[PDB]
Symmetry: D2
């Protein structure tokens, strides 16, 4: 039951199942995974593809020769399995040189290095067939107010993304960029902290059509925000290029639990939205198997990611297909929300006495919205207490 | 010491000092204030002007005749005192008819009523000299996932703001709009929950140049965000039309404490930013004197708002003027952050071996940022432990 | 399906279904309910009983004669229906006289009034058959640091509860007290803000055996705490006298959603714990039907409270009864957690070389905990994707 | 100005200035410090003493011979400088064997190992003169609901602490235990998550007089709680054995900023409380110099910890000594809060018609508390805008 297949478009970062379990207070609990073994094990589980940071695949500081041998091994595993590489990204956060950022480091020579490191991996990603290149500015930010002039930092961030856009267009690459927001951790505050801030920033770039967002469930929830609402605004703007699925229990450190864990009802409304809006991009899991687990637990946790998506998809489809739910949606006037407020125009609205002078405000106020009955039907469907 | 005068541009909402103290669990503790008395008392304290919701000035449901008598009394108090009215707004949240929203209510007849109520007060605001018209969509949102299709709701929100822009341009009014974000309360989640989401939404309106943001200190802090950082992004985008100053102690209900209370160091960095960027709009206080206070406490709390701004302005100016702080800023390379990363261009950057092939990553990584010394100089200046 | 009956011990406050919908930013959306009608409607829904504040039943300031007529009407409705009154409480938060608290008001005459108001309602509660008397100190606290000496306030709080204990013991009443914690709202910070703080305070009272806690789901979640964990500590201490069930979406204002809404997985683990520990007290719902709803929505929301408890009870029972889950619990060594660490004693432990000198730390470290497989079985059971 | 000396009782953990800067997303940015160099550098800065985990001083897995050489080097540095060791603790969180906890690991052999590792370091701590032994149960907890039966885990936690108490009493040691709470990180939820929960747990131990709390500023603030209020309850109970001073910006990952950073006004009210209550224990800094800093920044950050305490102490003393503040405290009736509510007794209170029957509730309700004027005097004193 609920068996994933490649058509479900489930993808995983190499750094997810490969997380060794080292956290701020503890050493690694698992040995390092060979990327070739991860490709083969994920293929057997029914995954569609994998993603990577440059430093996940090529150990930092590798010579041009060692680099080639790592890529060839990886490519052969992809060719044997038919696994895809739909997305790639750069590690601009682990090495100590990035301790004050990559694109917005105060030191200019670090900013130039960060751009050259990124451009090198764009070339590789395009070769492997990636359609989306993700940027997570995890070190862009500050712990103290005087350390970063944020207006200058946004100038430097815009400069960097404009140069990347000039690079891909000059090379004729068919790849787009997605900014992944996070409000904090590892910096005290991170620049572009939410989906909203990232969407607003994109509109000031020279070629906005090349950039979208890669929202992550847990990151918006670290600010206490409604993740389905934020995804809806991204879809409304035409900017949902990619998505990171996982779980998070409220406002605390970034947990990266398996998808379905954390806020389960938010996961249900998210899947309802993605499916009903026809999102066609990868369903990418950015999660960490807890460091309590051995390698059997790693693959159990990865399998649970896909299983929970498929269960929620079934329940959301049954919710929307139920005639009693359709009746409830009409009782709550969800259909009237789709009607234009004033397609008759401004002047007609101003001359309409039923819109103000003769509007019966008390009769309208007395109408119940019937939202609680609708939400209990949604709860019944999620829990399988009806079909 | 620290005496406010009208040139300091301090303004107050009628609903602030006039808050009667009724909260979700308690009845009012103060009698209602006559708006004329508030104008005169605020003028004596050194305020520059006042702001209002329509329903603060004209009791809801007033006839056209009673409406005129309320406005004339108010105008005469303004004329006697020289007090200005730089901003006005609509109450689309108190009356039960708005229980599911104004512009994004599911019921279409409510949405049309909300627009007509708003347009009526724009006319009045322009007559009184307001330059900014604020919209706080406090009822736009939901408690449950099925109650609101957020994509349709954003269509309805865009429709409403586009119609308001068509109205002001057809009337030839010199007034601009500012959206005030809030993440939650009184709805479970509110649409456009942060400065970022509001900035992104503005870019999809038909005439974006007419719209900016009115961020409030406490509202961004209800999402755990850095308020100075968010203000910096608004300034970077050219969209800081107005601002609401108050205090908030972390992630909880909207406290609306007097400015300076709450996160004191964030208040310092905010004033540093506003003054150094040359913000020239009103310094508006959206605060509630706690319901523990009598009327003497109301005016003490209002006076403290202005006093704390003036103290922080002095400390921030002394911080920036100190040669030792200027030296510390250079030691932390704040000046290098202002330099373009690659004004030599993409091709020069790609051919620069010092940017990658011969970049000494370990030497760069070993440089300390000296951020802690800089921040302790900032602390010393805030506390007056140096000048 | 999932029909509640009186044996399920579901109870409701008069103030829950009777909430008129007035919130900090809006007027009431529903008319006031007659307490007699609430008793009859709740009886028809299958509820076991009702609870009340004094001021819910007797309008504040009622003469001794009017008081009697309100009580007689209420008693007759209870007698007609067989409905029970298992708990009562005092309103020490609505009237402006309590704006700085009841038991810990700075003014001594207010503290004496608060005790006399409480004692009067204890007499009534005992007459009606209440077994638990709840105290929620919603106004005990402060917005600013200098307003309240917290050590003196705790002296005054201990004094008040000791006097109440002396009163009930001198009257020979068979009633116990339960303190209901809340971290904030309506005060900036409330004294005894969590279950832990309340449990610790009880141990300093003169007769600790008379006092326990009444934890509320949403209140502990307003501090980001794990509500099942806190309930477990209360059960471990023998102090879970009563419980308030509802829902809350994270760290924000007190939402009081219907039970099952909010954190659904926390609701599942809560019901699992209550049932497996054999909690025998009332399942009391302290919730507010959203002000979007008319009276049909009020009773739908109340019915959903009980329905969701009954569904979760079924799923938790099926989880614990599943042989595959029992196997998983053994694989994760939940049974070894029940074994004493050192029943052989301190000296035996010190002389045991297998406990340190010859302990194979690397072999033990390599054991996986198999927690993810167990949690996915729990998810499958919650969602009805197995039985 | 504000020069620390040993009489100020400032202490530092070896792990604080010695933090190498490795965080969940990045490698170390600083080389390891020799504990002997830390002792000498801290002595030169004016510190009173140092603290340590066992594994800070003796590398894990050291032979009995290597162990002796590490201790002798350390002791000689203490003897040369006169530096004290007032507190020690155990590392039960870094090694992978503790991935599910120490005292509450599901595996019984791990729990026995954790006790033997702790007991070994108690012996060493007593030899070096420690008066307090701290326990931070950082791995005691869970990421998922089924992984930990919390009632059994509390049984195991009580068993462990009872055995430690039996050990110290059988050895005749003059050392007490302090539990350090934290709500989360690195586990999803940690057992005993706040000061309140820890105080309540202590009361169920066999010898409660041996145990107190070691609260940390940032940890209580990770739950959004008022740290001065929690310290006040700990002092009221007689249980403040030790304290961890640092800074934290709201609800997020554990930042461990230098003291004074984070919530500056909470730091002021904390110092006011500690000094006015006559706390005589160490002022211990548990902080991490940000990984942006080199070694000069490490010692600047450590110096700032002590400087900020000394500045706040001066401002709080001036606040309390100001006759205008004393007048304000009387106007807010802080002195009436110290008066017993009913020293005349229960029967006198019941027969007092002025306490209820003839209490003028409206006159009492009309009294303002004058809290805002008092708080602005506190703000003026903190900022040095009066003396
Ligand atoms: O940007 C790709 C990934 O980089 C880092 O691993 C982040 O922790 C993760 O959130 C992000 O998705
Ligand atoms: O929009 C004007 C004002 O309206 C309401 O009173 C809001 O509570 C306040 O935040 C806002 O500034
Ligand atoms: O104490 C009884 C009740 O009093 C108030 O209505 C509180 O809001 C509620 O939480 C509590 O349960
Ligand atoms: O218990 C001693 C110390 O141990 C760990 O380093 C904790 O992170 C710190 O909070 C605690 O004070
Ligand atoms: Mg994450
Ligand atoms: Mg991610
Ligand atoms: Mg506000
Ligand atoms: Mg505002
Ligand atoms: Mg509540
Ligand atoms: Mg309650
Ligand atoms: Mg800490
Ligand atoms: Mg600590």
């Amino acid at each position: 039951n609920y068996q994933p297949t490649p058509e479900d478009r489930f993808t995983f970062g190499l750094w997810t199942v490969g997380w060794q379990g080292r956290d701020p207070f503890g050493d690694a609990t698992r040995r390092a995974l060979d990327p070739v073994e991860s490709v083969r094990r994920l293929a057997e589980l029914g995954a569609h593809g994998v993603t990577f940071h440059d430093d996940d695949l090529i150990p930092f500081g590798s010579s041009d020769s060692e680099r080639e041998e790592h890529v060839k091994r990886f490519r052969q595993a992809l060719d044997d399995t038919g696994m895809k590489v739909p997305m790639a990204t750069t590690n601009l956060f682990t090495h100590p040189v990035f301790k004050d950022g990559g694109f917005t480091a105060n030191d200019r020579d670090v900013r130039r290095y960060a751009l050259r490191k990124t451009i090198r991996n764009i070339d590789l990603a395009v070769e492997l067939g990636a359609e989306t290149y993700v940027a997570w500015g995890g070190r862009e930010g500050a712990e103290s107010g005087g350390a970063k002039d944020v207006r200058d930092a946004l100038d430097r961030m815009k400069e960097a993304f404009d140069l990347l856009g000039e690079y891909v267009t000059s090379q004729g690459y068919d790849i787009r960029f997605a900014i992944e927001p996070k409000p904090n951790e590892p910096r005290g505050d991170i620049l572009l902290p939410t989906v909203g801030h990232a969407l607003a920033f994109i509109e000031r770039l020279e070629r906005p059509e090349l950039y979208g967002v890669n929202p992550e469930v847990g990151h918006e929830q670290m600010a206490g925000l409604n993740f389905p609402h934020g995804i809806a605004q991204a879809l409304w703007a035409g900017k949902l290029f990619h998505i990171d699925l996982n779980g998070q229990n409220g406002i605390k450190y970034d947990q990266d639990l398996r998808f379905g864990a954390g806020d389960l009802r938010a996961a249900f409304w998210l899947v309802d939205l993605l499916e009903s809006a026809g999102y066609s991009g990868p369903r990418h899991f950015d999660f960490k198997p807890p460091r309590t687990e051995d390698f059997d637990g790693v693959w159990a946790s990865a399998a649970g990611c896909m299983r929970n998506y498929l269960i929620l998809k079934e329940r959301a489809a049954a919710f929307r297909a139920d005639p009693e739910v359709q009746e409830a949606l009409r009782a709550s006037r969800l259909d009237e929300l789709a009607r234009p407020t004033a397609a008759d125009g401004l002047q007609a609205l101003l001359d309409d006495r039923s819109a103000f002078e003769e509007f019966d405000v008390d009769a309208a106020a007395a109408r119940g919205m019937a939202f609680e009955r609708l939400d209990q039907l949604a709860m019944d469907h999620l829990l399988g207490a009806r079909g």
